[PDB]
Amino acid sequence: ELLKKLLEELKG
Amino acid sequence: ELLKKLLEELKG
Amino acid sequence: ELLKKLLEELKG
Amino acid sequence: ELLKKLLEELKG
Ligand SMILES: [Cl-]
DSSP string, B1-12: -HHHHHHHHHH-
The structure was resolved experimentally with X-ray
- According to the 3-state scheme, what is the secondary structure of chain C? CHHHHHHHHHHC
Contact B11 A8 (CB under 8 A): yes
Closest C-alpha among D4, C3, D1, B3 to residue A7: B3
If you measure from the C-alpha of residue D4 to the centroid of ligand 1, how many angstroms do you get, rounded to a whole number? 14
What residues of B are in contact with residue A2 (Cβ under 8 Å)? none
**CA A8 vs CA B1, B2, D6, D10: distances in Å:** 13, 14, 20, 25
Angle subtended by helix axes C2-11 and D2-11, to nearest 10: 170
CB proximity list for A11: less than 8 A, separation 6 or greater: B3, B4, B7, B8, B11
Resolution (A): 0.9
Cβ atoms of B7 and A3 within 8 Å: the answer is no
